[PDB]
Design a protein around this ligand. Structure first.
Ligand SMILES: O=C(O)CN(CC(=O)O)CC(=O)O
Ligand SMILES: O=C(O)CN(CC(=O)O)CC(=O)O
Ligand SMILES: [Fe+3]
Ligand code: NA
Ligand SMILES: [Ru+3]
Ligand SMILES: [Ru+3]
Ligand SMILES: [Ru+3]
Ligand SMILES: [Ru+3]
Length: 649
């Protein structure tokens, strides 16, 4: 049977679950999902029941989503409650630190300041800010209130033990835990900042806009970002302490039943959701408050399947809570992420030769690696510009570029015999790409071509081709050479994958190859001993220039599609400085003074350059590059990008 066993934590919740059960039976057909109702004493008892295969689903706040993730529960987010309009679904809130403009201090200078909290034990007002500050607090850190009382000079921390720690209630004597206290709650803590009582208020992004209508007033405030800078209040998305999901349905990581859970809930909102006015209303609690779901919910969004709990909660939230739960405080080694059995081996060699300054983490895919850098399991890796885009939108930034001598050149290579082909009209021809979503083989050439055909349905523009990463049924997988499941994969087991592979695809099957300016020189004239390249001459090939003409291969400077941004090392913002130093020190020892091919870094890289000003993916890639990728995103199929675009569009 297709049964979703929902877990309730109270008799009122269980009664609603039963009404939920009986009404869905009148709406869902025989082959569809039905609900069962398991009543337990608490949210943690529900988490344990789900993990024990005695129930299937429960909706949790962020704190318990974290608890549900830890072993041995290992639950996962599947469906997201959303609020507000259908056009702009508000799935998360942002915990921010608001300050007065020109007060002259950053997040890392809060010791001694006066703080305004919404209330002790609340998320944005306490657990998150104190969670992040935890190791900055003085020892002993237990009890936590004593440590905070000895960190801020004074504060208003409603519901704090002012008798034993009167510093915490200096700004609100008694620290009344009710609205009788002027500085209690979300309006109160911001009022505690506005009135001049405190120097910082830990609140939600929307508190400022709800308590100050005129933007002129809002300009007198700023936000403290975790990189120790400030930003205006309406840039909370790029300057917050944490992005927190409001209410989240969780299920087992393996054993589900994510498929049924979404079918059940999506059906339920379509017939009993907001503005549906039936006997049974999914988001009403006739004899309670927020039973099973929050009464203010407007519907449900499916959580993208690539996303786990650490990625859904976010790096900084996980850091804050882990500090509160465990209470553990210490440049540290840089954990590099390797993708192959050949790449890991190089990493282990590199690790022992670094006297411990480099450690090694592994994963199957680049996206898996990028996810491990986001959550802290890994620290750094080198990426093609196309993956830097993914990494940037996922939160990471570039810290070092690999220089090869401004970046490398992207060109279109054809066979010289074929005198007919031009850049003007390539429709109906056979294309060879390094892979989908890569700088030289896709983002640059297909970005330009998008502007000339007005769509990204490129399998209907070219007759066929090989663009590793495309869907296996696509005409852009027909020319690939991989065998079995390897066919058309964007990895080594597909022989037409990469710069060289795409050129090989041209030699043997295709009409045009989109690669970089050195690819042809390195695979002709005997440079590449493989049979497919051994006897090739670089004079039998030429490049397609944008004006519509063709030029020889070694004249790439005058005949090129666009300058491609170099590959770059990406990391988290909180480890940018440390990766920048250890690697600049590492190439000084092992630089210009790989067993297989392009392990960790490309093999034609001389050094690792600094960027200074270009420490974000938009600054590094360029404006025109980012807009091209935006146009190509309409037809793109990246699941990692889908997940971290669910948090940050
Ligand atoms: O919240 C509660 O537990 C009390 N109930 C009364 C009851 O048990 O029916 C709320 C109400 O129904 O108004
Ligand atoms: O390559 C250069 O140095 C200048 N480019 C612009 C560019 O590469 O985007 C001229 C051109 O490509 O037509
Ligand atoms: Fe590249
Ligand atoms: Na919390
Ligand atoms: Ru009751
Ligand atoms: Ru119907
Ligand atoms: Ru009743
Ligand atoms: Ru150019």
């Amino acid at each position: 049977d297709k049964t979703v066993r929902w877990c309730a934590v109270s008799e009122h919740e269980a009664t609603k679950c039963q009404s939920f059960r009986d009404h869905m039976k009148s709406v869902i057909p025989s082959d569809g999902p039905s609900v069962a109702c398991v009543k337990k004493a608490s949210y943690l008892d529900c988490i344990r029941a789900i993990a024990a295969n005695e129930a299937d689903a429960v909706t949790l706040d962020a704190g318990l989503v974290y608890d549900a993730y830890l072993a041995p529960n290992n639950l996962k987010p599947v469906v997201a409650e959303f609020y507000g309009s259908k056009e702009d679904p508000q799935t998360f809130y942002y915990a921010v630190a608001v300050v007065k403009k020109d007060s002259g201090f950053q997040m890392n200078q809060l010791r001694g300041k006066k703080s305004c909290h919404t209330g002790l034990g609340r998320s944005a007002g306490w657990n998150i800010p104190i969670g992040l500050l935890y190791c900055d607090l003085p020892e002993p850190r237990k009890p936590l209130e004593k440590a905070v009382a000895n960190f801020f000079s004074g504060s208003c921390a409603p519901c704090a033990d002012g008798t034993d720690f009167p510093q915490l209630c200096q700004l609100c004597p008694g620290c009344g835990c009710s609205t009788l206290n002027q500085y209690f709650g979300y309006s109160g803590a911001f009022k505690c900042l506005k009135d001049g009582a405190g120097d910082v208020a830990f609140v939600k992004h929307s508190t400022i806009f709800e308590n100050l209508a005129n933007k002129a007033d809002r300009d007198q405030y700023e936000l403290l970002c975790l990189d120790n800078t400030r930003k205006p209040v309406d840039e909370y998305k790029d300057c917050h302490l944490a992005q927190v999901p409001s209410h989240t349905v969780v299920a087992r990581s393996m054993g589900g039943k994510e498929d049924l859970i979404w079918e059940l809930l999506n059906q339920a909102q379509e017939h009993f959701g907001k503005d549906k006015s039936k006997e049974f209303q999914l988001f009403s609690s006739p004899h309670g408050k927020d039973l099973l779901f929050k009464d203010s919910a407007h519907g449900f969004l499916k959580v993208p399947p690539r996303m786990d709990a650490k990625m859904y909660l976010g790096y900084e939230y996980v850091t804050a809570i882990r500090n509160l739960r465990e209470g553990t405080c210490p440049c540290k080694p840089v954990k590099w992420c390797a993708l192959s059995h050949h790449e890991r081996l190089k990493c282990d060699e590199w690790s022992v030769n670094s006297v411990g300054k480099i450690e090694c983490v592994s994963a199957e895919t680049t996206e898996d690696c990028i996810a491990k850098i986001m959550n802290g399991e890994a620290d750094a890796m080198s990426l093609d510009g196309g993956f830097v885009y993914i990494a940037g939108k996922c939160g990471l930034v570039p810290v070092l570029a690999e220089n090869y001598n401004a970046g490398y050149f992207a060109i279109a290579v054809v066979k010289k015999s074929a005198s007919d082909l031009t850049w003007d009209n390539l429709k109906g021809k056979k294309s060879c790409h390094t892979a989908v979503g890569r700088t030289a083989g896709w983002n640059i050439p297909m970005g330009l071509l998008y502007n000339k055909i007005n769509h990204c349905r490129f399998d209907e523009f070219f007759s066929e081709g090989c663009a590793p990463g495309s869907k296996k049924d696509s005409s852009l997988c027909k020319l690939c050479m991989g065998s079995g499941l390897n066919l058309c994969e964007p990895n080594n087991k597909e022989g037409y994958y990469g710069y060289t592979g795409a050129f090989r695809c041209l030699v043997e099957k295709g009409d045009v190859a989109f690669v970089k300016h050195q690819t042809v020189p390195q695979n002709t004239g005997g440079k590449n001993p493989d049979p497919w390249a051994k006897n090739l001459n670089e004079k039998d090939y030429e490049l397609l220039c944008l004006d519509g003409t063709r030029k020889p291969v070694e004249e790439y400077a005058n005949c090129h599609l666009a300058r491609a941004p170099n590959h770059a090392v990406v990391t988290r913002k909180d480890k940018e400085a440390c990766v920048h130093k250890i690697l600049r020190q590492q190439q000084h020892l092992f630089g210009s003074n790989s067993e297989t091919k392009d392990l960790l870094f490309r093999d034609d890289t001389v050094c690792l350059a600094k960027l200074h000003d270009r420490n974000t993916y938009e600054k590094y890639l360029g404006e025109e590059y980012v807009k091209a990728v935006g146009n190509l995103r309409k037809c793109s199929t990246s699941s990692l990008l889908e997940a971290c675009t669910f948090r940050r569009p």
